[PDB]
């Protein structure tokens, strides 16, 4: 019932990440969990995002990319350990 959102800058903020969403018609943002390095608390580049509406999740999957949050294209992808492993590896640049 939840997704992953990545290819985000380390400065894309829960708040503004929300601005993007609301402005799709999706108004049920259930928590907003960013992934981060404990050492220094820096955004790992991807946040786990929840949503009660299992329809809007498509309204994001399709609509969120092709919008630009700070010149980067979002990457909404269903939750999964090989996406988990997909993003964790990407934060190594």
């Amino acid at each position: 019932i939840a997704l992953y959102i990545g290819n985000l800058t380390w400065w894309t903020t829960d708040e503004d990440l929300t601005e993007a969403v609301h402005s799709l018609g999706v108004n049920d943002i259930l928590e907003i969990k960013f992934f981060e390095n404990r050492a220094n608390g820096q955004s790992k580049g991807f946040a786990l995002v929840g949503v009660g509406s299992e329809a809007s999740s498509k309204k994001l999957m399709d609509l969120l990319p092709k919008r630009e949050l700070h010149g980067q294209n979002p990457v909404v992808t269903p939750v999964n350990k090989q996406f988990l492993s997909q993003f964790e590896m990407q934060s190594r640049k």
Partner: protein, 203 residues
């Protein structure tokens, strides 16, 4: 020959703090203070709840320095043999930083037999409802859950304290804290540096 009268040094460049023998200071056992939170995860259950109605938490801690053998010591309170906290605590909504501090100091310690705070030494922010706290606000965080502000509490020449029976008032010399986060945590253990700017006087 004639020397010229030194000019006033801005406190921002030269802060001079008076330190006294740690032996000047003593404690009288007092009524034992429990902690408001019960288990290890009741504090965040409480943090969430408060942040909703109250908003971001504002914690403050006082750093009280004494000296022995020509080396600064910081007054910690331990309980078990593995737990050290600075005196302080949550502020009330709309309460002043310092005034509140005095209230907490006087609360946790303080003379029942009948506080100078002029300096800020640090800030620590807790981005989420979890353990880690940082000396800054990570760029992706807009609303941090807790703000911890630390002050240098200039101690009087002599003082009697009231250590709640369950606590132990110890005086930690700098080198015990330095580079020893495993022992005292990232805040406490970063005090030696945080204190180095002060020009200390060993009375």
């Amino acid at each position: 020959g004639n020397k010229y009268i030194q000019q006033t040094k801005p406190l921002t460049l030269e802060r001079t703090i008076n330190l006294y023998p740690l032996t000047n200071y003593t404690f009288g056992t007092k009524e034992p203070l429990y902690e408001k939170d019960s288990s290890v995860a009741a504090r965040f259950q409480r943090m969430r709840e408060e942040f909703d109605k109250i908003g971001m938490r504002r914690t403050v801690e006082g750093v009280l320095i004494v000296h022995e053998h020509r080396l600064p010591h910081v007054l910690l309170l331990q309980l078990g043999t593995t737990f050290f906290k600075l005196p302080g605590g949550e502020l009330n909504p709309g309460e002043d930083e310092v005034e509140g501090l005095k209230r907490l100091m006087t609360e946790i310690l303080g003379r029942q037999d009948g506080w100078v705070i002029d300096d800020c030494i640090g800030n620590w922010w807790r981005p989420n409802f979890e353990p880690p706290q940082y000396p800054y606000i990570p760029a992706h965080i807009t609303k941090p859950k807790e703000h911890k502000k630390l002050f240098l509490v200039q101690l009087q020449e002599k003082a009697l304290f009231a250590v709640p029976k369950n606590y132990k008032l110890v005086a930690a010399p700098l080198f015990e804290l330095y580079d020893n986060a495993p022992g005292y945590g990232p805040i406490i253990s970063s005090l030696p540096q945080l204190l180095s700017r002060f020009n200390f006087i060993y009375n």
